[PDB]
Design a binder for this molecule. Structure first.
Ligand SMILES: Cc1c([C@@H](C)Nc2nc3c(c(=O)n2C2CC4(COC4)C2)CNCC3)cccc1C(F)(F)F
Length: 473
């Protein structure tokens, strides 16, 4: 009795499971499938599958376009009803209403179930991935068209649910971001050093207070971390040609990291006087120290990256003068990264909020997953989409997400914020050219051992003494 399901002449989502169309790894977990089998199982009539819905909608762009998805789920929804029996045909021939017994049960046990799973996909799509519709107005047109042409008593509650979500997201992106954290305790006083409040023209590494540099960079990096959406990381989309559209928050995070790291390097090697340069390196290790007190691991490893860089790491005469206890701070920070990040991961998972995780490790691990797993599995001459590959990426993005909920009890200083948002150490140079300049500047200020060490004039007119990293109170 196969003929209860609709035929392949009329419906593409009812062909049998085979080893040529679906591989699996309780609700079953799919390893690989054709897109039709993935859509079918996304909307399967016998059970709901919230883990697969979530993971599919996070990752589908690596195997299917949004417009193709919408077409496929609409096609999924439009199930053909079976032909009436000879007796039902006789009934309507006689002028009567037919009994319709199988038609009624097929509606109950197939059509309605599938259709409510399609509307659930729509709801999850608009609720958690509204960006696809912000990025494509015609996709939003199609969605609203499809949703307003869904008729029926059982469907209309969903149509409401979806329409109301679509209203909220349109209203929210019209309004923009707002202030949505009341401080749950009193934040500490903003710290100031040489630069006076408002006097932004004097803002620099040594002239702002090291505590406040570290706090304001932590607030900034916290917001950047929190703004990354999972799909920005799937498929390596931030390395592809449409990176600026598909990965905006991700690329903001990456470019911030690049600009802060290179700015630290620039501050160091452009201070040619040894003693001033020691005070600069020492101030950066103080900022590191405050990053670690805040559990901004992102900022700790940006300082580490700068201290391990080509231009900076070779500056033996500078590091000789750094106090032993600041050397120990810097050594411990480096040891976070050793052995595949062992101590980092242990500390991450044991602290209480708030923190900023190191973002670079997630990129590294996602790239390894992307490069170490095939896009397709071949079975019997057919290519199936490797869905396990996407699930493994989605699980890494879910680790990201678990820490995106950790606001700091720190007050924003708008001008210091803007100073760090507007860091541009490279200028109009390309990265490679800029880092070649940095390395050449390093060789100038501390030549390779056979050549002697010149002295260089001082460049800072204010005192080099730090105020330290203990706050007021
Ligand atoms: C501690 C320190 C650093 C840290 C960030 N780098 C560092 N530290 C350590 C290890 C290591 O391999 N590295 C560098 C060497 C590389 C490979 O080429 C760079 C990673 C190994 N285990 C013990 C700690 C940088 C500059 C000046 C110092 C200071 F002056 F304090 F000693």
């Amino acid at each position: 009795e196969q003929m209860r399901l609709p035929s392949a002449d009329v419906y593409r989502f009812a062909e049998p499971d085979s080893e040529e169309n679906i591989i699996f790894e309780g609700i079953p977990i799919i390893k690989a499938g054709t897109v039709i089998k993935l859509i079918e199982r996304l909307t399967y009539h016998m059970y709901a599958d919230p883990n697969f819905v979530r993971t599919f909608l996070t990752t589908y762009r690596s195997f299917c376009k949004p417009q193709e998805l919408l077409s496929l789920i609409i096609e999924r929804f439009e199930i053909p009803e079976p032909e009436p029996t000879e007796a039902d045909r006789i009934a309507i021939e006689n002028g009567d209403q037919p009994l319709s017994a199988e038609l009624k049960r097929f509606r109950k046990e197939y059509i309605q179930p599938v259709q409510l799973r399609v509307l659930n996909v729509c709801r999850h799509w608009v609720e958690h991935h509204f960006y696809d519709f912000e990025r494509d107005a015609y996709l939003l047109q199609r969605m609203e068209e499809f949703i307003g042409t869904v008729r029926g008593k059982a469907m209309k509650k969903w149509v409401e649910s979806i329409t109301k979500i679509i209203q909220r997201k349109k209203i929210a992106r019209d309004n923009g971001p707002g202030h949505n954290i009341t401080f749950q305790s009193s934040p500490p006083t903003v710290e100031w050093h040489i630069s006076r409040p408002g006097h932004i023209e004097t803002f620099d590494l040594l002239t702002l207070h090291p505590i406040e540099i570290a706090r304001q960079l932590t607030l900034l990096e916290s917001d950047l971390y929190r703004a990354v959406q999972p799909s920005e990381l799937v498929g390596s989309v931030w390395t592809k040609e449409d990176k600026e559209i598909n990965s905006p928050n991700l690329l903001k995070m990456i470019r911030h990291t690049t600009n802060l790291t290179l700015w630290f390097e620039k501050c160091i090697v452009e201070t040619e006087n040894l003693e001033e340069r020691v005070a600069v390196v020492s101030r950066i290790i103080e900022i590191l120290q405050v990053f670690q007190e805040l559990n901004n691991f992102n900022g700790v490893l940006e300082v580490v990256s700068a201290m391990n860089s080509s231009p900076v790491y070779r500056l033996d005469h500078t590091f000789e003068q750094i106090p032993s206890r600041q050397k120990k701070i810097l050594e411990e920070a480096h040891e976070l990264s050793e052995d595949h990040y062992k101590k980092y991961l242990a500390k991450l998972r044991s602290i209480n909020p708030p923190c900023v995780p190191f973002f670079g490790i997630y990129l590294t691990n996602i790239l390894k997953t992307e490069e170490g797993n095939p896009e397709v599995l071949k079975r019997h001459g057919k290519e199936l989409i490797n869905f396990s590959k996407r699930r493994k990426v989605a699980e890494i993005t879910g680790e990201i997400q678990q820490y995106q909920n950790q606001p700091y009890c720190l007050r924003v200083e708008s001008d210091i914020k803007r100073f760090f948002e507007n860091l541009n150490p490279m200028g109009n140079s390309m990265e490679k050219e800029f880092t070649d300049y940095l390395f050449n500047k390093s060789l100038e200020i501390e030549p390779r051992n056979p050549k002697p060490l010149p002295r260089f004039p001082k460049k800072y007119s204010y005192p080099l003494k730090s105020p330290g990293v203990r706050p007021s109170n």
